[PDB]
Design a protein around this ligand. Structure first.
Ligand SMILES: Cc1c(Cl)cccc1Nc1ccccc1C(=O)O
Length: 264
């Protein structure tokens, strides 16, 4: 309840089947605003802000606590428990895809289905795995973020959005720039340091892997990697949408594909 208030938990919709919409990096739950009308009639929609969102009081971001994805999982599960949800479909963008995977391992009965958008188990390359990022280049990026956060945001937002959708670039920039810079850097380091590859096989619920074209954060091969290694029944949806934030850039088309995946 203090947690429900802290993370801006919102429940809306006229349906019964519970649908959790969990935003990812650089946004808050408002990233779902243009998807939402498509689900109100026949779902009960649960939204929340990750503790690192710009819309959450930065006093709640305890750097001694949030050192791995596990405490983010704790927050998600405490929310669903407090709302009395014992089964739901879960949609996770970006880091929230991994949070949902870990949550499902902890609570295998809680999720009927996971829908993963812009998901990667590991951003960094190594000998037998392409993630899309080298350690050396990422340290240069972290230096830039520290030196001038504003300039970093304005360089990064068009890459993340990917497609030439200026409204979405401005909207992503808005919510990224609302994040306090030391939180953004710390969260970024957290996730670049994370490696979910070893746990993927532990998942037993069905996963729908939504993969856009030319996703700055997620090579096509990573979607295929998820398909091969996630332990349950997996379906890749190769969206006809460019970029890492399809909910911001192509919400009408994304909404339709989410509806199809949820009906499957
Ligand atoms: C790609 C990237 C850079 Cl280069 C720097 C800083 C951040 C990102 N991204 C991310 C960091 C944490 C969690 C998710 C993401 C994501 O992209 O979905």
């Amino acid at each position: 309840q203090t947690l429900l208030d802290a993370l801006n938990v919102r429940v809306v919709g006229s349906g019964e089947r519970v649908l959790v919409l969990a935003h990812g990096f650089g946004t808050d739950q408002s990233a779902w605003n243009r998807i939402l009308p498509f689900f109100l009639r026949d779902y009960r929609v649960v939204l929340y802000d990750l503790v690192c969102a710009g819309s959450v009081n930065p006093d709640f971001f305890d750097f001694r606590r949030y050192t791995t994805l596990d405490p983010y999982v704790d927050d998600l599960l405490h929310i669903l428990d407090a709302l009395g949800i014992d089964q739901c479909a879960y949609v996770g963008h970006s880091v929230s895809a991994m949070i949902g995977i870990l949550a499902s391992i902890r609570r295998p009965e809680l999720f009927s289905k996971l829908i993963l958008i812009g998901a990667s188990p590991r951003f960094l390359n190594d000998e037998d795995y392409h993630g899309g990022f080298e350690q050396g280049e990422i340290e240069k990026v972290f230096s830039a973020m520290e030196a001038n956060y504003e300039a970093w945001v304005n360089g990064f937002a068009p890459l993340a959005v990917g497609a030439d959708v200026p409204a979405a670039v401005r909207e992503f920039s808005r919510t990224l720039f609302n994040m306090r810079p030391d939180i953004t850097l710390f969260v970024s380091r957290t996730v670049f340091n994370s490696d979910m590859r070893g746990v993927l096989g532990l998942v037993k619920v069905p996963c729908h892997i939504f993969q856009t074209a030319r996703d700055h954060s997620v090579p096509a091969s990573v979607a295929t990697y998820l398909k091969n290694h996630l332990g349950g029944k997996n379906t890749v949806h190769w969206l006809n949408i460019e970029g890492h934030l399809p909910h911001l850039s192509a919400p009408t088309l994304l909404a339709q594909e989410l509806r199809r995946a949820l009906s499957h």
